[PDB]
From a paper:
Gsx genes encode HD TFs that are conserved from Drosophila to humans. Gsx2, as well as its paralog Gsx1 and the fly ortholog Ind, regulates specific aspects of neural development, including dorsal–ventral patterning and neural fate specification. Gsx/Ind proteins have two well-defined domains: an N-terminal engrailed homology 1 domain involved in transcriptional repression and a highly conserved C-terminal HD required for DNA binding. Prior studies revealed that Gsx factors bind DNA both as a monomer on individual A/T-rich sites and as a cooperative homodimer to two sites spaced precisely 7 bp apart.
To determine the structural basis for Gsx2 binding to DNA, we solved the X-ray structure of Gsx2HD bound to a 15-mer DNA containing the -TAATTA- consensus motif. The crystal structure of the Gsx2HD–DNA complex was determined using molecular replacement and refined to 2.2 Å with an Rwork/Rfree of 22.04/26.45%. There are two Gsx2HD–DNA complexes within the asymmetric unit of the crystals, forming a butterfly-like shape, which display a high degree of structural similarity. As expected, Gsx2 forms a canonical HD fold composed of three α-helices, the third of which, known as the recognition helix, fits within the major groove and makes specific and nonspecific contacts with the DNA. Also, the Gsx2 HD has an N-terminal arginine-rich motif (ARM) that lies along the minor groove to make specific and nonspecific contacts with the DNA. First, the glutamine at the canonical 50th position (Q252) of the HD forms water-mediated hydrogen bonds within the major groove to specifically interact with the thymine base at the fifth position of the -TAATTA- motif on the sense strand and the thymine base at the sixth position of the -ATTAAT- motif on the antisense strand. Second, an asparagine residue at the canonical 51st position (N253) of the HD, which is conserved among HDs and is essential for DNA binding, forms a specific bipartite hydrogen bond interaction with the adenine base at the third position of the -TAATTA- motif. Finally, the arginine residue at the canonical fifth position (R207) of the HD, within the conserved N-terminal ARM of the Gsx2 HD, lies within the minor groove and makes two direct hydrogen bonds, one with the thymine base at the first position of the -TAATTA- motif on the sense strand and the other with the adenine base one position outside of the core motif -AATTAAT- on the antisense strand. Collectively, these major and minor groove interactions of Gsx2HD bury ∼825 Å2 of surface area at its interface with DNA and work synergistically to allow the HD to clamp around the sense strand of the DNA macromolecule. The most striking deviation is the ∼20○ bend observed in the DNA due to Gsx2 binding that is centered around the N-terminal ARM within the DNA minor groove.
Numbering used by the authors: 205 to 261
Amino acid sequence: RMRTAFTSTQLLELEREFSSNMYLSRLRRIEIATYLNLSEKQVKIWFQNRRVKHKKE
DNA sequence: GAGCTAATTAAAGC
DNA sequence: GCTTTAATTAGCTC
């Protein structure tokens, strides 16, 4: 695929979620996606990569 | 059987 | 050329 870019707002809301939840139901993933104007796959992969980063730190 | 972690790959912006 | 990170893949597990 081609890489997605996120606005500063989207990144800040995605990282507010990761602060509370670190894992998401399939339903919450669709919620966040619709609120953020993102697709479900974009939210899913962001959360996967974020967890990898969070362990390394 | 979707969904998770790890290890990559390589595209994105400088 | 460099660093950060979105995306893919192989493997495991309930």
